[PDB]
Amino acid sequence: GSHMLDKIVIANRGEIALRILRACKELGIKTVAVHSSADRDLKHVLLADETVCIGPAPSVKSYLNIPAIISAAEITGAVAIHPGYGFLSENANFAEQVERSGFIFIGPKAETIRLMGDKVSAIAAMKKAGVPCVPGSDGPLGDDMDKNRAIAKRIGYPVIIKASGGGGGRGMRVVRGDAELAQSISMTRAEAKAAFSNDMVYMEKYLENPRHVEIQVLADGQGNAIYLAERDCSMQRRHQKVVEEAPAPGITPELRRYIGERCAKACVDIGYRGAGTFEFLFENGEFYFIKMNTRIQVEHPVTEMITGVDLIKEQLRIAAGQPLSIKQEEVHVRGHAVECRINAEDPNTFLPSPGKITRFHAPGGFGVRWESHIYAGYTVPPYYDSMIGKLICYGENRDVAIARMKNALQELIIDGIKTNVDLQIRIMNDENFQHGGTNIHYLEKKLGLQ
Ligand SMILES: Nc1ncnc2c1ncn2[C@@H]1O[C@H](COP(=O)(O)OP(=O)(O)OP(=O)(O)O)[C@@H](O)[C@H]1O
Fold first, then answer.
1. What is the largest CA-CA distance in the chain?
2. CB-side exposure of 130: number of CA atoms within 13 Å?
3. Phi, psi of 288 (to 5 degrees)
């Protein structure tokens, strides 16, 4: 009924903030938009019920200023805090503290975060859960080469020496023979201490031509948990996602209930609460666990489209104590979805291109979703990311979804800055892409990338 959150803090900014603001307004939740002195002009900022300047431009003082944010709630009387994605969404000390200050944290518990935060641990947990993992050391590599030489041989080359601190493409090394093993473990151990401040490392097999399939889940922490089909995010350029889609072409419903059900089991097993995502590498009709994003993702709209489920409301629902409103058997995968991220960037340098938007026009029409905070005379700052929007198109089928997307990319007008739009069009036109089922290496190589 109405055992809903009185007022929550939107501990974020940009498109994500707007989106969250939107779901708040539908549930009647009051909103407090905390922002940085430079985001005083954010769309979402202008629509919030209450606003608060937490700091200066630089993230470490604003968006990552834990106290500032936490105090912002105090003064406002909010009951919860929504991290969105990418700042502290995966920061357990912030979750910890939010809890400790007596606020609700729109996400799982800190314990769960740290748990999934450490690859090694993560892996062990899921191995246990029945979730399919990459074969590797099933532990931190030791220091005596002999055994390590043995791990490898067993799992077989090539391999990959991965640290447990995550990072994001940073802290990884590919070994293909016994000769480079030693160096690798070492190079990698060193890259980790410095970077994440955790030299711990694990070994696993390296996958050549796999796709990136991810499973969306939801848990209430009451015993319920559902999977919302998969998403294909193989469209990468330097680890940066560019094109997401649901469902994943080539994925049979059977397969879909396979990895899903176990993903659902794992959630329960770990006492998972809220939204979250299971990242899988996919080669040879086989799934392999890479990690777990204990949060809402940038690409969630695609999934809300093919399912009709509103992720954010659900998070908000779980957060307020409610049980899952939906049952697995009520979840039905319908049509096809494709999201193109829109970036403020230089198609040559791939470098951020900040500036003010002079002219702007958004595409509309059937099965077209525009997710962005930009407008005309809006100034995109240099401080934060390059993403300014999400262009999501729906269709009774893939080919339809694609067609719409082409049109949409054209009606789209963003003047006064550099954007990745041309690129999007080009992919849309990608004959390989039209066929589909391309690997995470496709973009990089077509881009004439070395
Ligand atoms: N065992 C593996 N075999 C092949 N490719 C792998 C393997 N493990 C990781 N990768 C590649 O490394 C990339 C980064 O892996 P991972 O998701 O673990 O990095 P991260 O540091 O956690 O990234 P991010 O924070 O950006 O999500 C993957 O997208 C994938 O391209």
1. 64
2. 12
3. -145, 125
Amino acid at 139: G
Query: What would the two tokens of residue 295 be?
Result: 């949060």
Query: 442 by DSSP, 3-state: which?
Result: helix
CATH no. for residue 34?
A: 3.40.50.20
The residue range of the domain holding 260 is: 89-133+207-447
Helix axes 119-129, 253-270, angle to 10 degrees: 110
Is residue 68 classed as helix, strand or coil in its secondary structure? helix
Catalytic annotation on 256?
no
- 134 in ligand 1 pocket by Cβ < 6 Å? yes
**Closest C-alpha residue for ligand 1 atom 15:** 169
Q: Which of 147, 176, 206 is the last residue of a domain?
A: 206
- Catalytic choice (237, 273, 295, 404): 295
Q: For residue 207, report the phi and psi dihedrals to the nearest 5 degrees.
A: -105, 125
Resolution as reported, in Å: 2.5
- Positive or negative, the Cα torsion across 392, 396, 401, 403? negative
- Structure-block tokens of residue 257: 């209930």
Same domain assignment for residues 103 and 117: yes
Domain boundary among the residues 173, 206, 239 is at: 206
